[PDB]
Amino acid sequence: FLVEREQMRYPVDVYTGKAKIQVDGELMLTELGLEGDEGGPDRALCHYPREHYLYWAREFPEQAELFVAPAFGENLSTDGLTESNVYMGDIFRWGEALIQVSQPRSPCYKLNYHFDISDIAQLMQNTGKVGWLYSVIAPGKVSADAPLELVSRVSDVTVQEAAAIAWHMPFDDDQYHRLLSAAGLSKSWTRTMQKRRLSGKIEDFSRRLWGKEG
Template identity: 65%
Template sequence: MNYPVAVFTGAIRDYPGSRPSAIAKRAVSGTLMLTEYGLEGDEQAEQGIHGGPDRALCHYPREHYAHWAREFPAQAGRFSAPAFGENLSTDGLTEENVFIGDIFRWGDALIQVTQPRSPCFKVNFHLDIEDLSLRMQHAARVGWLYRVIAAGRVGPNAPLELASRVSNVSLRDAASIAWRSPFSDEQCLRLLSAAGLSASWTRTMQKRRLSGEIEDFSRRLWGGTRR
């Protein structure tokens, strides 16, 4: 099945009271080059936690915006793509039916799902909702990230097409294991067994197995401070 896709890129900008971010993106109308580090013209601030080969693209389901508009009716007009800083926006693909390791054909390129997006405090500042990152995490409406396994020309005129499925761990399952369930060595092993899992999530799950504990999310969710 093919999924029409909208495409967005952005440049780094300053956010008073927060840190620089490229979360504000604009639609792309023509074809552009996709490399292992992402789309031509797209930038990532703080590349230790954003971007890189395992996080070259961010995808957010368009249908989630109706949920957020209901949650925040006074700000409903702000909830449309690419409000969450996504590069790709589709209807029909969600955390329920996309799996760790899924490989999609997109134009001349091949991209592979590596992990759910770990929401951070920058979405709070971008949309001016203090606890939005936490709400995203609780609802598992976070989107996901890709690595590029074959570079090439891509664009909004080329749909996404599922080429291969290599694990039985959905993104919804991965999010539940990561953020909602108590520590379980069995569940950590299940996630670690998912082909294509990102290196950062592999490290995190292995650290949990060694410590027997789930790490603190507060710095990622709140940026070290709360307004």
């Protein structure tokens, strides 16, 4: 863990909903999320990498204009952070608040309704370009002018592997045991990996990904 000492700092665009509109000054980050916005604690903030938009536009040239932040619902938009360099448990200082990565975002069939593309959820899930959520470790003033500083790297499980373990690999107790060991793991994901260990099976994903057609 030398990255803690590198003082990594990433500028971020901020958005809140009434849906999501860009915020420009300073607002309060409370335990439940951004003031004026809307496993509550574990999902108070959403993140989606801007890089991913190039991939969707190149994939769906015809509806390229739908693919711009914050089309995926995210609160935070950055360059330079993705599923392969963000780790489960990472704690970041933002202005005066402390936030911790708690799980990858799970793609939902509602996404398909929103882009009017019938298999975007399945595609998000298959590519692993899903973003992630934070739980707020300490509330406080934050701002669109204040960058995200990495301050603690406490696990060796990346968002990418956490997503592969949940959705890309065949049943494996060891991996489920490894995922349960990552600090900051949200309650619902703890519940889901624990249930697979006990049941001996992988819970269905059709309803989440396809709605009534699942």
